[PDB]
Amino acid sequence: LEELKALKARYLGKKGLLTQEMKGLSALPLEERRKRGQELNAIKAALEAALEAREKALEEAALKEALERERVDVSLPGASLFSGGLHPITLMERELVEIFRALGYQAVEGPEVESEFFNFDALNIPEHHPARDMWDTFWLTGEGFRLEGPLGEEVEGRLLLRTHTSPMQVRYMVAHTPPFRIVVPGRVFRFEQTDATHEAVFHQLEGLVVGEGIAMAHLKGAIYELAQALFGPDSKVRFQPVYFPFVEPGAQFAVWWPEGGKWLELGGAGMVHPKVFQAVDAYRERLGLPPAYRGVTGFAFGLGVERLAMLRYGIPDIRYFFGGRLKFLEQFKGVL
Amino acid sequence: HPITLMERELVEIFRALGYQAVEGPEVESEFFNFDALNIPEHHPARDMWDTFWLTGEGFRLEGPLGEEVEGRLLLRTHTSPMQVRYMVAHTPPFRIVVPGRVFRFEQTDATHEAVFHQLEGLVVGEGIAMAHLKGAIYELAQALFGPDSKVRFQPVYFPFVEPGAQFAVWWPEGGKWLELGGAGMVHPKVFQAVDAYRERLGLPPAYRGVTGFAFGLGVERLAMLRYGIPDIRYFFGGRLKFLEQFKGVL
Amino acid sequence: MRVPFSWLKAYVPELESPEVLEERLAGLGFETDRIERVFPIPRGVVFARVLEAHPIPGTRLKRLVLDAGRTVEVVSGAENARKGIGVALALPGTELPGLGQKVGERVIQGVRSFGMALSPRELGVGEYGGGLLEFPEDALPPGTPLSEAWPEEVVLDLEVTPNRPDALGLLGLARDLHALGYALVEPEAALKAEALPLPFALKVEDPEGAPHFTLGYAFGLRVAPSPLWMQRALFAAGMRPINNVVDVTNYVMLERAQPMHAFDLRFVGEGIAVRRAREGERLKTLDGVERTLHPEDLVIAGWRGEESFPLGLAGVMGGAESEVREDTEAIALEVACFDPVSIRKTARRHGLRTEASHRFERGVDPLGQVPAQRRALSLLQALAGARVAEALLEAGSPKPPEAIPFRPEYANRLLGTSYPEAEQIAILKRLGCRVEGEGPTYRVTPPSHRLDLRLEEDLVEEVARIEGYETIPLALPAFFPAPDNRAVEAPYRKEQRLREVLSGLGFQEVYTYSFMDPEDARRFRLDPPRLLLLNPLAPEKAALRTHLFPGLVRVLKENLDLDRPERALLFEVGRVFREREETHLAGLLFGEGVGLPWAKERLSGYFLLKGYLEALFARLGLAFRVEAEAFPFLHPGVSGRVLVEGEEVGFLGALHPEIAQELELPPVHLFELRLPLPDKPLAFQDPSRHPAAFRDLAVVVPAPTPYGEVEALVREAAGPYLESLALFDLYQGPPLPEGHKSLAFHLRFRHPKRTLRDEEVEEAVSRVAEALRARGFGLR
Amino acid sequence: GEVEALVREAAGPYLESLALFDLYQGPPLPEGHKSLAFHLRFRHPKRTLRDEEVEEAVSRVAEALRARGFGLR
RNA sequence: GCCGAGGUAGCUCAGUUGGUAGAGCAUGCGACUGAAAAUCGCAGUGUCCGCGGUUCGAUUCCGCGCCUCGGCACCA
Ligand SMILES: Nc1ncnc2c1ncn2[C@@H]1O[C@H](COP(=O)(O)OC[C@@H](N)Cc2ccccc2)[C@@H](O)[C@H]1O
Ligand SMILES: Nc1ncnc2c1ncn2[C@@H]1O[C@H](COP(=O)(O)OC[C@@H](N)Cc2ccccc2)[C@@H](O)[C@H]1O
């Protein structure tokens, strides 16, 4: 109600003012005894009593309605905004990448639809290749499709779906020059019947460290670091010889899982093979770029994401990731 | 907040070099902020920082090993005390960067605050050289201003680093040398104060046969130059019209 | 420190240019804040010789007759204007920097003043303007242009770090430029002493304050103004010439960073006594300032018979009375090393900062006194034609610096350099060290003046710098970190993710001064701060914050006042103080709410926030629920605590109305948890592929009951096979008792291996109705 | 989309915000029509602004709103 | 720890032959709308830093201590 009880400031102001500052002000100071004090008084006797009274009056009138009215069952469900989440494959990948990032590795990705040149040939896996059977290639057919190589040039060859991310080794090298450390995550496709620990579409993680002075000791150090970061100080790695046409001193590695007392076989590894360096530089000439991998050496490694994820998040079956079940996914909302 | 966007990027930059990101307390003891850092009383060199002294009974400040640390309470005038704390806690080799808000007593202006953020970098280990300190900054430089960047080291003094230095990074896209922070090889007496403190806590010495470098930079100033904020008093200002500007720096 | 290029170039003859010197001093450890040309003196100013100074009757002015080649007169009110001195005569038609309008013939109190005799301010050589410059009467031939004997100078402004008090003296600074290979020229104080007794005695009573105290004796003095080179030099360094004696003291001081002071013997009495001021004693220093003395002040006193009086505030500033003037013939020269702390204390106790105290605080050569005495005594003999005595008066025997074990192998190890041993030893020797070694670890003993060289690391620094930090190569260390360092950065990545996640939903981050206004303790109804300040920037910033919202809210008011945000969802992560420093997360909602820019239907307030928050921990996969709790700063009607994973950690509600009213603010909501948030380890759990038997069921409950207790009970007895739950509606209407409400839940059961029969669900839906009764609730 | 695009456009540089606080397709309006009520907001960098300036703008917005083919309740 | 200047309505701020404690957006009921806006009267949240004075509503003399600044002395 005071809204007016306020405006009354001029209702009492000007009006009352029509007594002093409105009745000969060029002589008012020569009249000061009583009359001026009449207002000096009322001007104070009113402003304080009035203006404040009405205030505190409502200051305890409005603030009173609320205190009483507003009563909520706080513990009552509230607005239902949505709450996102990230796929388990990503949670893992991210952590793997953050793990290698700390070692100085760069994270770059490549295409899923490759050419027989980058997936096999440049990797030393010629035709009818006996060793070309660990991957069960998905062949493609498509006219009007423009696959493009490293230097944005149109790359030719029989199109297909990369059977591993290793082709990013060949691509990234014709593009950049050493020294460098790269890890290239990615979805790969193979032709094999699926089961509890197998898929036809899964993810790997390449690691390529080229440079003069690079040794297998360095390859072993990386895995030793991958191991620690993933299973703590009480972890350890195991390297055993194995074959890949693109790494001569080849190896397969396993990390020791303390909290489970079991050796897990993570991926392949080894020192980059002489002919991959040859295929790279060789490809560069074709593109008029000077050779760069002539005086260097380097190591590569590639691991199965899902399998690490599985063991890492406890998912019993590998066919869950690409399943699509919201009841499955939502489970990981919070892995950081 | 812009301070965070920056900090994050700085941390991601050093993370890639193998550095660990740990934080320390804002309310320190005169022991970790000055003494263990070689800045005794009436210290002529104890005047680059204008200490904020505190007063509080019932307040429980706690040192590294969760023990109750004694001494005259205050607000850390730099993050460097995290150098002393982290060393009595862990053992070398290691690489650490410890971001954090620091407080100083100085009139504010366009490029000054009383409350601002720094970023420590401590790399202890046998075989560590100043060449390694210079390499880090050279990397900090690149990541921040591209291949055409370069660093500049000039002698300067700090009681806690003997071969001391101040460094600047070359900003191509602006053709100007920016003075980022201090640096240098950890001083012999800091290693001494650390191990010395450990005994007191019954831990074996660990920094006897090692050497190491530290560096500390001003976040805001880097931020400012990095995001173009003309005045440093904007960060802690509170203006939503200012903040919202950075919604999207990634 | 002002460094007059040419003054330096006198010790370091071959310096390239002011530019190069700055480049050089840069690499040496000193950066120049600025560089500047200083003595532009027009051709119009000449040297003149005051033949006679005639007082203009009736005035306070003087008619000066000057030999300015030809004879001229000039009027001047300068007290110091007298016969027999030289002056800087600005001829009519001269453009002066210091007073810009063109000088000319002007009649004053009856005399055709031919131009005017300048003063320090008027010539632009100093800020002083209370007298004319006073040149040696025979300085130059009357009439020669002044510049011809006072060339434009260049002054560098050098930052001299505390570890280089030897550098507060150009001869010291010079010694560094020398090590870079620059020829060094030390002045050779050429004394012609006389073996005779000193008319006074020394009696150091506080050897603790005056570790080393020497007095000199120069007599038969002829006090007069300094030659131009001296006056020019002092001015470029920021100081104003005063005469013969006094000037040489200041000159030397700047040269070798050794403050000294000539006491007039007329006042010295029997001898000089270095003691502490007698709590009470008064002293009127040079600045004209009459002061009282704190019994802790180290005084330079004199005694007469059984008397004792102060003559100067030791190490800080001399006394006004005994200063040398024109009528003085003999002095007692003070050249000592005073306790750095004593000076520091005293200097500040009296709010004084002199070139003297500044150096005595930072540090003086513990053994550079005597060489200094000769330099001064020599000069006095050459400019004041003094007759210097042969013996000094020493008090204290400082011990030369000790040896430092120096291995050039380690220097190169610690630097990552491979400087040949030879270059190292060479350098060290140029900086004045004594390298008494055979190899591999030498015995390097530094110069008395290097206070910053005690350790072998100190020495290695000397190589890096003299060799050039730019010569230390780049590198990158490679190693496996010690095990107790693994994962040390979890705490960090955790909180960071947090922020990042918040910034996700829609919260705008905000940083707020750690400071707190003691008043807000009452203004927001909180407990007073435990940690306060002994030096607050302002009482408003007197204490250390105990909560994050007082600030979050304030930044709101401040927003709505500069701009009027129609709405705002904010958050802040910061350190709070109270018993223990602890990290907190704070939020704040306010405004219309979330809805459609048009359609009035808005979604907001308390439940909007609890909305986001539930959505939040949802993302983090953490248990969250609120349970009404009284919080002195929240509407009693809307106020509870927050429960993360079961453990309480903060609160969520609306700001207390009474408060909003004071800060003249609308309604507002907030919360403030404590970090780090609980950590729930994840346990994967295969979800059954068998259909979930689900059924609805309302529960008539009394209006006062909280939805929290209801659900807690339903879910509880709802059985294990219970998948979901949910509250699809709350009804407080007609077909229900008085003060009651019904909660309709959408339950859902499910079995892992096989489907379930309704006979099982009932045996459960029932178990829920039974406890719903045993307690005291209905079931519509 | 077209409405706002036009309003903001001619709304002048000094225009800070804009906003659509309500869309009305009702009675006091022609057939097959609707009104869009915008909450504009202008602002000057160095000093305050006089309503004589805003009008010279609020108007420029009404003129193009007509040259085009829209009304202005 | 010295000279000298400012510190007044959700905000930006001039000011002083004083009736103006206010002007410029902005803000509070009737009533023009469904809901607003450009509108006409009707009005002032204002301790014109805080403790104390100052005329008939005080900002200003005037007292000391406080938020702000230049210079100064240090040196971030
Ligand atoms: N169907 C599937 N489902 C899940 N993970 C699978 C998989 N097929 C393969 N993997 C994972 O993929 C990893 C590597 O694939 P593999 O074909 O064995 O080697 C592939 C090479 N491209 C890796 C390599 C790179 C560089 C140097 C040496 C080796 C395996 O260790 C395995 O854990
Ligand atoms: N008021 C302020 N506002 C913004 N940035 C500031 C600041 N005060 C200082 N800084 C920044 O803080 C940086 C370092 O602080 P400063 O006090 O100069 O050295 C501080 C040492 N703690 C750093 C150091 C660590 C390890 C080895 C050597 C040095 C500066 O380079 C500057 O850019």
Ligand SMILES: [Mg+2]
């Ligand atoms: Mg040194």
